């Protein structure tokens, strides 16, 4: 309680690992896109730099930093701040990208619901163009419900090692009938028909559990 | 939430099956035309490649893809997009086919109704030639009513394992009468007659349910 | 919606019965000429082959067909086309018959009305010979009025299980008078007479209903 | 017991080390920010001046001091007073800093709990601005529980050579289901869905011990 | 035994040194605050006057004194009385100081234990003000245990040339755990946590010896 660390270095200086070893163990064995976000995986310092570059990046304003000789006061967060999966992957070369080299991600219409919305510009400029994302509403519902910060509830589902159990629904039957064009009777059949209506009958449920490695096992 | 997947591979990389196992189970037991659309059925990777090739094909523009080293931003859809049954089966050797090897399908007059229509060129060039499809209007009514995307409501009915219940109609009786050519009376009958009019009488209904295997059972 | 049928077989492959069971039930109990047009009646596959051979025959051009390995694009009709009762029964050994074994049917003068006509060659070559068909005009009036395709409105009337109600007409009386050959008077009668004119008087109607089995009941 | 020390010097005069040698040994080997808070580390007098400047600074009022010729009576503490880690690092150039050169530290919302609070002004003026500190509540809980004076229980945890053992918690599984938009059945799937609810299942524990040098070893 | 001393002088007259030479030798080499309490150090008479002024001051009542011509009977002590370190340093200008020029010392809350207490008024009037003395209880425990008169056991420890050996104690480890706010699972981590409890583990000892000159040597 009298020999506090030296923070004279650049970037993150104190060890984030004094209380966060489990996340370190998880991240050291990551084959994902960001193995080299910190410039390496073999050394502990590279992983610490990666954590600094992700959880202390240029999000809103300068974080808290210093080098013994001087210290820059923290503006909106001292140690670290949780950031959305997308705040880095929002704009690339078209606008002012957060990281030079970061690829602008996806392409969806801007999530503007009746209750909540997101400040990030989804359309990336091609507002009339990018609209045919089938999943789409998966992101919208995640944005609507505040479970993870901003839009991570759905974005983390299918890129990460996160097991998920979901309840699928699909009705047993959907069917339809058929009418004639003003003529029918003792003729076997009219020359032409017409079809209208599409009715429904009987309901089915489905549940599936997915493991960490992505294998899909259904408990049908 | 710190060990996201590797997408360095070509084509679809992450497992689509983390949330879609039931469709995998359905498709693995498919004896239909597209058992080998993904190059195989025995391995899971082949089925994943098939799903990529169908739901992420060249429809409008490049989908979202990457390999860790670089990433191509998605243009109109990030993960996958629902596509009509016909968007692949629309043109073959005559025009620019979507798949080299895909057979141009069917042959109908272009669906141009009073309200809606389809951009796909049905006639395949032989506009004056292909017209005598009896079913025809079945496709037109499916196009008119937006239940499935574009023209799948009817196209999926008779090629797939989709049970259907329809209400058939045919009137009980259609009949007609007979006139003479200016001569008749106490002669038994004139040398020649003429027949006109075709009238109707009494109505009949019919309903039929079809199972998955195509067996036709009618509840007459 | 992911396990569509296999069409690798020859001829019709998918089951036509997924939506047409009532016609199957009607045709299975047919004692008519075409019980064995499909090579059998006991098996469902034989009936399906019969439907293919009738509604998908060589009429104008190749229909749509395939076997998984390859697919032949449909030329003028994809699934099936309505065909006239006669298009098969038009020419036999004299010309190019549609079916080897099909018997050329009937024999009438070519229907060439003032408004419409038929491309099928009725006379079968013996143009000066086949002319004394009493019914004849029954076919002509059916051709004139587009109720069934081409010339089926009359052709289906007396060969099929189709109940018909018609209004017969015949005048009550047709009679005539008588003149002498320049001589008459107080002689009782002349040696010879002459007869001219044939007049008419009073009108009668008649209506008859015929059941499926051909029994003739008249509501006189 | 008759030759008491001379305190004629400025600042701290008597040796604090007559009973506090272990803390001296600990502080002499400090590579942290405050090696030169006393103007040196090599001489004992510099370390004594550092202890005076830290534990006898201008906190509330003048401490006890004298020079033989005169003595200033102690106001609220004679020898030394324990001071919070932050009482020096609370305000810099904006307000009246305690040390000219001391950097204002961190940036958090003012800790105003339902039970206790702190008089130090955390927001530093930018009340609406500094709010996105992820750790935040770590400081609040330390303030709530009186284990160290004011807000040192958490502030000393990650800057100092203080080994810590904590029990991490994270539940085994969190998952969710899925509903259709009024349409489903024998259609394979509806054009669009909706997703609601996020459920939980099974619990996991985690414990980690951290050494003096900051190495993170987890006993998973 | 017939030529007893002359005490006609003022103050102390007989030589205190006839039996107390060692204390004289100790005090002659004193660089502390009271070199000139007797008005000098060079002459023996000045040191004798200092001893008189300290051990024969106005404490409770007049001591024993005389000048041959007259003698004042001793009231509570004839030769000298042991006095507490503080009885002179208790009140200055606020109350009735013992010496005009004596500085009121320190500032602590009044020592009022469950068993013993002191009549001297510690708070000096600022009862609500002077409370933040960290050492504080060091004086209280000295007052509780009668080893030196009143409150000298601790007061003599850190101002005088008195070597001390003390046994320090501090436990090896004190640590804590962490809980979530109603949400956790397959989400990597919840948006926010909570921390409770502070546990202990393993014990450490420490002993230190301090010499006359104040150098701190620890036998760790
Ligand atoms: C008492 C509550 C605290 C005070 C006073 C300060 N901190 Fe911290 N701190 C933390 C990190 C991760 C850094 C990196 C900064 C760098 O690399 O220079 C810092 C830095 C500082 C600094 C210098 C930089 C600046 O002034 O902005 C000061 C003066 C400072 N800290 C004061 C992390 C943490 C932390 C982890 C949860 C806690 C509890 C504290 N800091 C507490 C205090
Ligand atoms: C937060 C909402 C998300 C961000 C940011 C990104 N995604 Fe995805 N994603 C998905 C698939 C099926 C792929 C295949 C691409 C490939 O094979 O390379 C991807 C890929 C990416 C990429 C790299 C490729 C590119 O930039 O176009 C990035 C940068 C990316 N994704 C960012 C699928 C999904 C998905 C399933 C429903 C979700 C929720 C997300 N992606 C979310 C995000
Ligand atoms: C979406 C509107 C459709 C597409 C695309 C295709 N069909 Fe069909 N189909 C039907 C039958 C009775 C057959 C028999 C052909 C055979 O036995 O091989 C077929 C066949 C095909 C084929 C392969 C043969 C070919 O290309 O000509 C393709 C590529 C094909 N179909 C594409 C019947 C029906 C049907 C019943 C009313 C409908 C709605 C569709 N087909 C729809 C589509
Ligand atoms: C008997 C209980 C005590 C009396 C009477 C005094 N002290 Fe102390 N003391 C201590 C320190 C660290 C200082 C520094 C002051 C300086 O540098 O001038 C002092 C100083 C004094 C002074 C002069 C200054 C003043 O009057 O404020 C006086 C008159 C004085 N002290 C009287 C520390 C300690 C200590 C360490 C735990 C103890 C037990 C005492 N002092 C006890 C007494
Ligand atoms: C022990 C003193 C820690 C050190 C060293 C670091 N962190 Fe931490 N962190 C700690 C706790 C007890 C918690 C949970 C408490 C809470 O109120 O949530 C956290 C949490 C985080 C988070 C997420 C915050 C949240 O989800 O609520 C992040 C992003 C985080 N910590 C980052 C982080 C970094 C980058 C560190 C190195 C500078 C670091 N932490 C060190 C305790 C401790
Ligand atoms: C007044 C007696 C202080 C107390 C109590 C604490 N700090 Fe300090 N700090 C003070 C000054 C005047 C300065 C700037 C001059 C200097 O020599 O640094 C600082 C600076 C720091 C820094 C900056 C270096 C860096 O962050 O890398 C840090 C980290 C720092 N102080 C930490 C710190 C901690 C953890 C404290 C409580 C145990 C603490 N300081 C108390 C003055 C004072
Ligand atoms: C869980 C994180 C999923 C993963 C992994 C994949 N998909 Fe998905 N998909 C998911 C949901 C919850 C839904 C329905 C939600 C909705 O708004 O509709 C879907 C739906 C589809 C669809 C059809 C869209 C529709 O009919 O509305 C398609 C074509 C689809 N998904 C494709 C697809 C592919 C190719 C995947 C591998 C890259 C894949 N999905 C993964 C959830 C999840
Ligand atoms: C800023 C700190 C980022 C955050 C937050 C996320 N990503 Fe990232 N990403 C970033 C950069 C600078 C790059 C390009 C450089 C590189 O080393 O890749 C990327 C790249 C990706 C990729 C590309 C590889 C691939 O797609 O196969 C993917 C898939 C990716 N990022 C995913 C991803 C996810 C799921 C994130 C939220 C958990 C995420 N990134 C956050 C910068 C940043
Ligand atoms: C349900 C998906 C069907 C399947 C399987 C088959 N047919 Fe069909 N047919 C269907 C409907 C809804 C209609 C009437 C709609 C209309 O627009 O007329 C028909 C009609 C026919 C006809 C006559 C057309 C007419 O008179 O207008 C024929 C000759 C016909 N169908 C043939 C046929 C064959 C051979 C099939 C097996 C390949 C077959 N149909 C399957 C619906 C469905
Ligand atoms: C592009 C992703 C396609 C989609 C969408 C559909 N089909 Fe397909 N089809 C495609 C190719 C490249 C081929 C030829 C190569 C092969 O392996 O077959 C086909 C072929 C068929 C066939 C031929 C076999 C047969 O008819 O017996 C059929 C019947 C067929 N396809 C049917 C079909 C249906 C019903 C579709 C919508 C659900 C459909 N295809 C979509 C490429 C693509
Ligand atoms: C081609 C698909 C045909 C259609 C359309 C019709 N007929 Fe047919 N018919 C065809 C063949 C190849 C044969 C000879 C082989 C055989 O199994 O009969 C026939 C035969 C007849 C007969 C002969 C038996 C008899 O007259 O007693 C009759 C009566 C007959 N066909 C009637 C008929 C009718 C009424 C049709 C329209 C509803 C019709 N045929 C169509 C081939 C084809
Ligand atoms: C022996 C006579 C000591 C001298 C010389 C100094 N200190 Fe001390 N200190 C001593 C003891 C026996 C204790 C613990 C007793 C208690 O009641 O706590 C302390 C404690 C402190 C503390 C912390 C108080 C606490 O945490 O309770 C501080 C800040 C402190 N001491 C400072 C200090 C300084 C600056 C000194 C030089 C003037 C000094 N001490 C000398 C015993 C002795
Ligand atoms: C009355 C006989 C006293 C006794 C008993 C003690 N002190 Fe004293 N002290 C007294 C006076 C009149 C003065 C001021 C005049 C002077 O010459 O100093 C003092 C002063 C001090 C000082 C001030 C110098 C400094 O603190 O640096 C100190 C430190 C001091 N006194 C200490 C001290 C101690 C430790 C005593 C008990 C052993 C003690 N004094 C007793 C009068 C009297
Ligand atoms: C020999 C005849 C002495 C003369 C001359 C002085 N003192 Fe003394 N003193 C003497 C003895 C044998 C003792 C200890 C005996 C005992 O019962 O304690 C003392 C003790 C003191 C003390 C402290 C008393 C104690 O701690 O118990 C004091 C304060 C003291 N003496 C003062 C003192 C003064 C001021 C003298 C000059 C007038 C003086 N003493 C002379 C023996 C002798």
Measured CA to CA, the distance from residue A1 to residue A4 in angstroms comes to 7
Backbone angles phi, psi at B210, to 5 degrees: -115, 135
- Three-class DSSP category at C153: helix
Distance CA A152, CA E40 (A): 83
- Determine if residue E210 is left, alpha or beta; phi over 0 gives left, psi from -120 to 50 gives alpha, anything else beta: beta
Q: How far apart are CA D48 and CA D164, in angstroms?
A: 29
Ligand 7 pocket at CB < 6 A: A 134-135, 137-138, 157-158; B 12, 16, 18-20, 51, 55, 79-80, 82; D 178, 189, 191-193, 195
Backbone φ and ψ of A217, nearest 5°: -115, 125
- The residue with tokens 């305000």 is D91
How far is C186 from chain B, CA to nearest CA, in Å?
33
The angstrom resolution of this structure is 3.9
Residues of B engaging E, defined by a Cβ cutoff of 8 Å: 1-2
The C-alpha angle D89, D90, D93, rounded to 5 degrees, equals 95
Nearest to C8 by CA among B160, B33, B27, B214: B33
Q: Are B192 and B179 in contact (CB under 8 A)?
A: no
Residues E97, E109: Cα–Cα separation, whole Å: 19
Are C92 and C114 spatial neighbours (Cβ–Cβ below 8 Å)? no
State whether residue D66 is helix, strand or coil: strand
Give the residue among B145, D199, B164 at the shortest CA–CA distance from A172: B164
* Chain B residue with Cα closest to A28: B3
What are the sequence ranges of the domains in chain B? Answer: 1-83, 102-160, 163-220
CB atoms within 10 A of CB C38: 21
Residue reference for tokens 């999966």 = A85
**Closest listed residue to residue A169, CA positions, set D189, C175, C44, B186:** D189
- Tally the C-alpha atoms within 13 A of residue D136's C-alpha that lie toward its C-beta: 19
User: E154, E162 in Cβ contact below 8 A?
Assistant: no
* C-alpha separations of B70 from A100, B8, B75, C127 in Å: 13, 9, 16, 81
Residue C11 structure tokens: 């001829």
The answer to whether the CB of B33 falls within 8 A of the CB of A220 is no
Ligand 10, residue B87: give the atom nearest the CA. Answer: 5
Residues D208/D219, Cβ–Cβ less than 8 Å? yes
Tokens 């000096």 sit at which residue? E124
Within 10 angstroms of residue C212's Cβ, the number of other Cβ atoms is 10
Residue nearest to atom 10 of ligand 2 (CA): B79
* A202, two tokens: 């009987």
- What residues form DSSP beta bridges with D208? D166, D218
D31-60 burial: b if 16+ Cβ within 10 Å, else e: ebbbbebbeebeebebbbbbbbbbbbeebe
* Closest-CA distance of chain C to residue D185, Å: 11
Is A71 in Cβ contact with D159 (below 8 Å)? no
- What length does chain E have? 220
Contact B147 D191 (CB under 8 A): yes
Closest listed residue to residue A33, CA positions, set A105, A140, A121: A105
Helix intervals (H) in chain C = 21-28, 44-55, 137-144, 152-155
Q: Contact at 8 Å (CB) between E194 and D180?
A: no
> Please, what sign has the CA dihedral across residues D130, D136, D142, D145?
positive
The minimum CA-CA distance between D90 and chain A, rounded to whole Å, is 11
**Nearest alpha carbon to residue D22 among E218, C38, A94:** E218
Write the burial class of residue B220 (CB in 10 Å: 0-12 exposed, 13-18 middle, 19+ buried): exposed
DSSP 3-state assignment of A165? Answer: strand
Taking every pair of Cα atoms in chain A, the longest distance, rounded to a whole number of angstroms, is 105
The two structure tokens encoding residue E28: 């002659």
As to burial, measured by CB atoms within 10 angstroms (0-12 exposed, 13-18 middle, 19+ buried), residue A17 is: buried
Sorted by sequence, the CB contacts under 8 Å of residue A79 that are 6+ apart come out as A64, D133, D134, D135, D158
SS3 track for B146-209:
CCCCCCHHHHCCCCCCCCEEEEEEEEEEEECCCEECCCCCCCCCCCCEECCCCEEEEEEEEEEE
On whether the CB atoms of residues C46 and C35 are closer than 8 A, the answer is no
For chain A, the first-to-last Cα distance in angstroms comes to: 59
Q: Of the candidates C158, C160, C139, C134, which has an alpha carbon nearest to the alpha carbon of residue C150?
A: C139
**Contacts for C2 with CB less than 8 Å, ≥ 6 apart:** B23, B26, B27, B30, B160, D188
Distance (Å, rounded) from C-alpha D88 to C-alpha A132? 58
Residue C175, by phi and psi: left (phi above 0), alpha (psi -120 to 50) or beta? beta
């Amino acid at each position: 309680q009298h020999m506090w660390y030296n923070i004279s270095g650049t970037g993150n200086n104190l060890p984030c690992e004094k209380c966060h070893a489990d996340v370190f163990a998880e991240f050291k064995n990551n084959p994902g896109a960001h193995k080299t976000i910190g410039g390496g995986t073999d050394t502990v310092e590279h992983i610490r730099a990666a954590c600094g570059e992700c959880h202390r990046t240029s999000v809103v304003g300068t974080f808290a930093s210093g080098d013994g000789t001087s210290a820059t006061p923290g503006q909106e967060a001292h140690a670290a701040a949780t950031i959305a999966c997308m705040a880095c992957h929002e704009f690339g070369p078209n606008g002012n990208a957060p990281y030079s080299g970061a690829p602008v991600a996806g392409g969806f219409d801007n999530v503007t619901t009746d209750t909540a919305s997101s400040p990030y510009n989804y359309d990336n400029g091609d507002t009339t163009y990018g609209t045919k994302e089938a999943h789409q509403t998966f992101i919208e519902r995640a944005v609507e419900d505040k479970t993870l910060i901003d839009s991570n509830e759905a974005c983390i589902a299918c890129h990460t090692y996160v097991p998920v159990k979901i309840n699928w629904t699909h009705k047993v039957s959907l069917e339809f009938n058929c009418t004639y064009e003003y003529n029918t009777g003792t003729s076997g059949v009219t020359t032409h028909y017409n079809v209208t209506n599409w009715t429904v009958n009987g309901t089915r449920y489905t549940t599936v559990f997915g493991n960490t490695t992505g294998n899909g096992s259904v408990n049908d």
